[PDB]
Amino acid sequence: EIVLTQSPATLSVSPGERVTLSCRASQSVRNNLAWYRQKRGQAPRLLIYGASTRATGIPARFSGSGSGTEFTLTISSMQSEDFAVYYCQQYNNWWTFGQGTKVEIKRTVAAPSVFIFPPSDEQLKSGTASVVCLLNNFYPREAKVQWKVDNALQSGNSQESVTEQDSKDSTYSLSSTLTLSKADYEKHKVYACEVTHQGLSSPVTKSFNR
Amino acid sequence: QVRLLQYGGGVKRPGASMTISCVASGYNFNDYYIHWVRQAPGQGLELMGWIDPSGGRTDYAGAFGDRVSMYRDKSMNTLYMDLRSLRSGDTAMYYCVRNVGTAGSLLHYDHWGLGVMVTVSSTKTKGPSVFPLAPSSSGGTAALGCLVKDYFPEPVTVSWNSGALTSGVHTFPAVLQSSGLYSLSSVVTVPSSSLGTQTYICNVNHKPSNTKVDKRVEPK
Amino acid sequence: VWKDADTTLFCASDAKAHETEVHNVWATHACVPTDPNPQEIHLENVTENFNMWKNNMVEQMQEDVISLWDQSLQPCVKLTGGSVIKQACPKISFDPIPIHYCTPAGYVILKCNDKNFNGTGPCKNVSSVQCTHGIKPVVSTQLLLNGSLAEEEIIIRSENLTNNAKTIIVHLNKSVEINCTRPSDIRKAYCEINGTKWNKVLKQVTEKLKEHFNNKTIIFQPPSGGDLEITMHHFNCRGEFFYCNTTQLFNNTCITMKGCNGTITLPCKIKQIINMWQGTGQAMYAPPIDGKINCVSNITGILLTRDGGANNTSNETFRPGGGNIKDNWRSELYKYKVVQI
Ligand SMILES: *[C@@H]1O[C@H](CO)[C@@H](O)[C@H](O)[C@H]1NC(C)=O
Ligand SMILES: *[C@@H]1O[C@H](CO)[C@@H](O)[C@H](O)[C@H]1NC(C)=O
Ligand SMILES: *[C@@H]1O[C@H](CO)[C@@H](O)[C@H](O)[C@H]1NC(C)=O
Ligand SMILES: *[C@@H]1O[C@H](CO)[C@@H](O)[C@H](O)[C@H]1NC(C)=O
Ligand SMILES: *[C@@H]1O[C@H](CO)[C@@H](O)[C@H](O)[C@H]1NC(C)=O
Ligand SMILES: *[C@@H]1O[C@H](CO)[C@@H](O)[C@H](O)[C@H]1NC(C)=O
Ligand SMILES: *[C@@H]1O[C@H](CO)[C@@H](O)[C@H](O)[C@H]1NC(C)=O
Ligand SMILES: *[C@@H]1O[C@H](CO)[C@@H](O)[C@H](O)[C@H]1NC(C)=O
Ligand SMILES: *[C@@H]1O[C@H](CO)[C@@H](O)[C@H](O)[C@H]1NC(C)=O
Ligand SMILES: *[C@@H]1O[C@H](CO)[C@@H](O)[C@H](O)[C@H]1NC(C)=O
Ligand SMILES: *[C@@H]1O[C@H](CO)[C@@H](O)[C@H](O)[C@H]1NC(C)=O
Ligand SMILES: *[C@@H]1O[C@H](CO)[C@@H](O)[C@H](O)[C@H]1NC(C)=O
């Protein structure tokens, strides 16, 4: 019941550049604050404890500082391995964690390539229809996908999935899957995926006729 | 050379109880408290409680009042955690963590185990149906893929052309459907000119079901 | 003048060579005689900082009692890691005696004489001595026995780097007698305590805890679990390992109601199989000696832990603690520190 607030939740930084992360406590925690890092498929790793002391094996580009209810973690020059999720933790009263700040790679804006996939006949025979929309290799991550069926906005009937930032070109890709019964599917003609993103002046629509 | 090796992951049934465990080595087992920390998907890290392995004293988070037990087998450097009355909200990564202390104080954490994945559901084991995402025609590159649908539990693995094709492949994280079954798609971008001369096969592997599928996707 | 330092102490005692009692034998072979006329020098106008939670005298005392027990006890079987060691297990004579700790040439022991000193921070009344007062190496959990009392108020000792403390040591200013007996099945015993006397002191302890912890309501509850050595009041009486259930001692309702006065009788068991407080494993001893087995002790302190994981608007929860026998030595060595000249 001591609450740690890490904002912003996401940070975009160009490799080799400086980053500063923030941790705000709802209440004083003295200097009993630590920072951890978590990469994909790895355990969390201790970076800093006692607000400013580096743990064993942690390079000098990592720096912690803070007093009372406001703490920072700064990385003087971002390395490849440094792009990850960072958690603050207080151990003044019980143990509680911030919600984390993800540090992602900053690159040039890239608009998605958009593709729409009608359901397969074999799936239709099974009595269900999945319509898939693909947004390929875009940056930044923020993108909006709207399904329209005969110009009617569809909502609550689709699920989205996003890849982690590509280790090679620093882009994201996203799939949206609209799922209907074969019955409802066959009751409409025009299926469209509408995509909004920074790299696009006008939103892009990919569609097909049943 | 501290290590905390964990065991006990997998599918658990709602209403049941689970035991997970942690085997410690590379240090004096008696001299460090061990904390059990979980992270539910889309949620923050949460301490469940700690155990002092020297005598077995424990302290639990109130949010897990009645349901948790922590104990240990000293002679085996082994730590155990029980969690009873399991619900879907208990689906989470569970971590074994050792805690730095002084003579009179408990402080930060200095080593985390790799963690164990627990999935709470009533779903029956089942292999996926694989459907084509067929290419048509856009930008000199076309896209195609496989829809891997209605399987349980995780994971599935997908390769293209027996691992010979990795360029332009994106295999999306699985999503849990309202049915209790998982679904993902794997897509690949290829040259539009390749659609006639080249063969594309997705190889889907679901070990929990002993299901393997080889599906080629053709244009219309 | 001086600086903080650590050095190898030596021990002194009044042990007697004719005695078969094991503390006497150990001390006879490990210690010199006490100084008949010890010297204490007041340090006029000196303020000195102490830290009972960072005191190498505690580690040194621990090394001594381990050595003492390892030479003195004769378990039938020892289960220590990966091994089983069997030996003769004759009954022994067992009754702790005071040991003084003394500094070698070039060092002195500073002593805090402030009456309400909690074990950490500045001390205004400081003296120098060559040796500590005599300290009995009584090994026990939950309740501290046959130790010293606080001079004035009840005192709460806890490291204050965090609210996540380990042990909290309560130092009583009035001792309470505990009469434990195995009558002349053969392992059933009991401890008798004067209820009106105990509940008076425990109410004062409660009011001090309230003072210390932001004036919240103080609640006791039984130990969370773990080894019997810590879920029970555990101690050695005449060579026999006793385990006593203390739920009746930490009765919230007795702070007036009925049945709280009069004699409190705790149920106890003598055990042959124990977890070694040294932390090294387990040992088995022989069945109890015949006849009446009796130990009368002062309760002079209480070991506690505070529940950390539950919401606390209006209350704090404490459970009887112990098991780390360095806390036992801390309850007596808190007023001392070694310095180099
Ligand atoms: C200590 O301070 C007092 C003042 O109360 C003074 O009278 C005395 O002379 C001082 N003693 C020393 C250390 O010289
Ligand atoms: C200091 O403490 C000692 C305890 O030995 C006591 O006798 C004396 O009255 C106290 N007076 C001072 C110097 O505060
Ligand atoms: C013991 O301490 C309490 C306060 O903690 C006080 O009320 C009581 O009078 C003290 N008794 C003696 C004999 O000093
Ligand atoms: C005890 O008193 C000292 C003196 O200021 C204080 O620093 C500390 O917070 C108190 N609590 C402890 C450590 O017992
Ligand atoms: C630590 O000492 C401070 C003294 O300022 C006291 O207010 C606080 O209650 C102590 N910490 C606890 C009781 O956790
Ligand atoms: C303690 O109890 C025993 C037996 O219960 C009894 O004989 C004795 O009088 C009591 N008090 C003392 C100090 O022995
Ligand atoms: C117990 O202690 C009380 C002091 O509160 C005393 O009055 C009584 O005589 C003692 N002995 C008993 C109750 O046998
Ligand atoms: C502590 O609380 C009691 C009631 O809960 C109140 O009467 C008393 O004034 C409080 N004392 C302090 C020092 O806050
Ligand atoms: C102590 O006795 C109570 C009942 O009087 C019981 O509930 C509790 O479990 C006992 N403790 C142990 C460690 O046996
Ligand atoms: C506490 O004392 C009361 C008598 O007032 C008794 O009814 C109750 O059983 C006691 N509780 C325990 C745990 O011994
Ligand atoms: C407390 O001291 C008395 C006096 O020698 C002794 O009989 C008793 O056994 C001691 N208690 C313990 C636990 O050793
Ligand atoms: C018990 O307490 C009284 C006064 O504190 C003391 O005279 C007696 O010797 C103590 N018992 C032991 C064994 O020290």
Side-chain angles (χ1 to χ4, degrees), chain C residues 40 42 113 125:
Chain C
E40 184 166 343
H42 178 81
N113 300 289
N125 189 359

Side-chain angles (χ1 to χ4, degrees), chain A residues 30 92, chain C residues 118 158-165 211-214 306:
Chain A
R30 308 183 204 192
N92 202 55
Chain C
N118 67 30
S158 185
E159 199 171 35
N160 199 333
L161 301 166
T162 313
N163 301 322
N164 302 325
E211 205 172 60
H212 208 265
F213 285 91
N214 289 252
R306 182 184 67 79

Side-chain angles (χ1 to χ4, degrees), chain C residues 281-300:
Chain C
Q282 294 162 357
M284 190 214 270
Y285 293 88
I289 49 170
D290 283 327
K292 178 173 297 97
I293 310 173
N294 181 69
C295 291
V296 186
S297 315
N298 309 122
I299 299 164
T300 54

Side-chain angles (χ1 to χ4, degrees), chain C residues 246-264:
Chain C
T246 58
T247 57
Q248 289 173 95
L249 281 192
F250 300 96
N251 192 339
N252 297 291
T253 65
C254 290
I255 296 110
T256 306
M257 296 240 139
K258 22 228 82 117
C260 281
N261 63 332
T263 300
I264 293 172

Side-chain angles (χ1 to χ4, degrees), chain C residues 58 61-62 65 137-138 325-333:
Chain C
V58 174
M61 175 155 190
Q62 178 82 338
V65 182
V138 193
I325 305 302
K326 289 198 204 193
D327 294 321
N328 297 61
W329 317 147
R330 271 187 276 272
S331 71
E332 299 290 338
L333 290 164

